[PDB]
Design a protein around this ligand. Structure first.
Ligand SMILES: OC[C@H]1O[C@@H](O)[C@H](O)[C@@H](O)[C@@H]1O
Ligand SMILES: OC[C@H]1O[C@@H](O)[C@H](O)[C@@H](O)[C@@H]1O
Ligand SMILES: OC[C@H]1O[C@@H](O)[C@H](O)[C@@H](O)[C@@H]1O
Ligand SMILES: OC[C@H]1O[C@H](O)[C@H](O)[C@@H](O)[C@@H]1O
Ligand code: NA
Length: 443
């Protein structure tokens, strides 16, 4: 395994999110989230499905633990559902929710699985959305409150915490492009949501450190899409830069204490939120790690007629595609080298990486997902290149542990290393899962 070995203390996991797996949407005091409302809105989800049952992991998380162990993982990245903890968003605690996750943490730790807890993976309580949701500063305050409550109960056992998952998605897909909950379609509302998300992050970090019974390792998780111009023309380079600012720098820079990127501010003009010095200070609260969710690159062509940021993807039919994305492993090297050299966050974790395929159970009973195996091998090779470059990477989480409710695509789009039969709830490990098992064991 020359050149293939990762650090002996490397974190090896798989990842999930509460609304995608849990089900039990009305049980044990759970409130209504924006994704309950959105999934039950006609035509918002591709295939008529909802998260009402999903993988039934509310009841079945011991099965999930069994899979993690069968895989020889040493960690599990999962989210806590705010609707189970503070059903009204701003309001009383629901102790049955806290006690469920407490039991789940003890089960994980008992099994030798470090919990990597995401506080916010998109399931905003609907009552908050009724009051503008991420469009309101008050939501930031009450998000920090929620962070406080959870860390008070679980922070004697869970050291590693992420405040938000992918605030670009929450803001832009949820408030600008309308493809995620709550489903609004206004640029200024998306940018305002981005700010309040960032603010909430920063407020929560401070709240968590105060509320914690021991020192924590607190991070945030960002989707990053390395962007490349399709030519070196001024037009295509500028288009690459705008897309890069839209997705990456818009979040990285304020987190890094650099304020919002001025190119973007000027570009958005009227639509840009008002960002006082005080909020930017709070947004840059010191972090102990950064999580990177990596799936794809953007090869950008100028598109003056399109919506902001006026940049279209140029498809490359020479690169392989999965069920829903282009495969470009080298982009993971590039993005990590950029973070290592250009930004201050360290250590880094790959909090998600994975792919969707048209997975089926074969005649023999296995799932022969060689493309997903190759996806992991190629990305893990790039991570070995990045580590050889000095990048302080401390773990890797495959998205996902098991096939699940894939947001607007529903149960139809399978990302698991384990196959989920949605009718019987049986899980079965796919070939890529066995590969990860044996790679991790070998070391
Ligand atoms: O119409 C939106 C959704 O409403 C839900 O109550 C149904 O269970 C789904 O099958 C349907 O897609
Ligand atoms: O005890 C109420 C609930 O608590 C959860 O933690 C368990 O996973 C469920 O099976 C049970 O219904
Ligand atoms: O689309 C695959 C995955 O992409 C990421 O943006 C999200 O964090 C996951 O919840 C989603 O399932
Ligand atoms: O048939 C294999 C798979 O094909 C496609 O991805 C379908 O969307 C999915 O529902 C099915 O499980
Ligand atoms: Na393909």
């Amino acid at each position: 395994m020359a050149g293939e070995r990762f650090p002996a203390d490397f974190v090896w996991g798989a990842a999930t999110a509460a609304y995608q797996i849990e089900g039990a949407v009305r049980e044990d005091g759970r409130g209504v989230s924006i994704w309950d409302t959105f999934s039950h809105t006609p035509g918002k989800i591709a295939d008529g499905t909802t998260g009402d049952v999903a993988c039934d992991s509310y009841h079945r998380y011991g099965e999930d633990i069994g899979l993690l162990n069968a895989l020889g993982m040493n960690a599990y990245r999962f989210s806590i559902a705010w609707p189970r903890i503070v059903p009204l968003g701003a309001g009383p605690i629901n102790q049955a929710g806290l006690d469920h996750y407490s039991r789940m943490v003890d089960a994980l730790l008992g099994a030798g699985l470090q919990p990597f807890v995401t506080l916010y993976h998109w399931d905003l309580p609907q009552p908050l959305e009724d009051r503008l949701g991420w469009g309101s500063r008050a939501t930031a305050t009450v998000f920090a409150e929620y962070a406080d409550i959870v860390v008070r109960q679980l922070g004697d056992r869970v050291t590693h915490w992420a405040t938000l998952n992918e605030p670009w998605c929450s803001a832009m897909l949820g408030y600008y492009l309308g493809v995620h909950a709550p489903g609004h379609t206004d640029l200024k509302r998306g940018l305002e949501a981005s700010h309040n998300l960032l603010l909430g992050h920063g407020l929560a970090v401070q709240a968590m450190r105060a509320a914690a019974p021991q020192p924590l390792q607190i991070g945030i998780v960002l989707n990053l899409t390395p962007t490349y111009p399709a030519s070196d023309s001024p037009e295509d380079v500028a288009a690459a830069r705008r897309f890069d600012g839209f997705v990456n720098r818009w979040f990285l820079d304020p987190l890094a204490g650099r304020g919002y990127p001025q190119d973007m501010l000027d570009y958005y003009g009227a639509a840009a939120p008002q960002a006082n010095p005080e909020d930017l200070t709070q947004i840059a609260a010191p972090l102990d790690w950064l999580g990177v969710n990596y799936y794809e690159r953007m090869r950008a062509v100028d598109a003056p007629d399109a919506s902001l940021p006026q940049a279209q993807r140029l498809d490359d039919p020479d690169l392989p595609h999965t069920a829903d994305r282009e495969v470009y492993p080298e982009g993971l090297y590039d993005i990590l080298l950029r973070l290592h050299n250009d930004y201050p966050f360290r250590p880094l974790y790959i909090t998600e990486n994975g792919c969707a395929l048209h997975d089926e159970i074969a005649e023999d009973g296995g799932i022969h997902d060689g493309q997903r195996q190759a996806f992991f091998e190629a990305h893990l090779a790039q991570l070995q290149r990045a580590l050889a470059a000095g990048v302080p990477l401390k773990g890797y989480f495959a998205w996902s542990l098991l096939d699940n409710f894939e947001w607007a695509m529903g149960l139809s789009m399978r990302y698991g290393i384990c196959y989920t039969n949605f009718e019987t709830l049986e899980r079965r490990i796919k070939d890529s899962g066995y590969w990860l098992r044996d790679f991790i064991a070998g070391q």
